[PDB]
Amino acid sequence: LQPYRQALLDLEQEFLGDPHLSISHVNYFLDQFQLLFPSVMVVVEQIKSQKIHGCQILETVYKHSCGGLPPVRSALEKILAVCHGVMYKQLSAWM
């Protein structure tokens, strides 16, 4: 959500810069997140509903990480990388 927040701040600055800009410019600029966010929201709702716990959550994310949306794929890759970093920390402690 940090990149989304950054995009929102940039949009706010741009709209402050030009009083002739319309909401259509925001709708264009924000459409990438308008496509990205719904899939992640569905994934989060699924995670909540299935009560995925511990590393079993990681397996579900991996299954979801295999999605077809390239931007969703990249986002899930970032999330998976973070989860794998945590897993690797635990694995380091064990090993």
Binding site: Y88, K89, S92, A93
Partner: protein, 50 residues
């Protein structure tokens, strides 16, 4: 010496941290208990032994 202290040493009195940030090597930073055991507890055990 007296005048130095009252005027010159008074004038020249321009006599105006444990970085416990895990961010650098968090992966390499020991656990709080492990860090304690390795930095404090070994020293405490040494002093106790002595």
């Amino acid at each position: 010496i007296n005048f130095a202290r009252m005027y010159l040493e008074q004038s020249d009195f321009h006599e105006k941290d444990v970085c416990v940030d895990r961010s650098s090597e968090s992966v390499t930073c020991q656990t709080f208990e492990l860090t304690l055991r390795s930095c404090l507890y070994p020293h405490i055990d040494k002093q106790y032994l002595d």
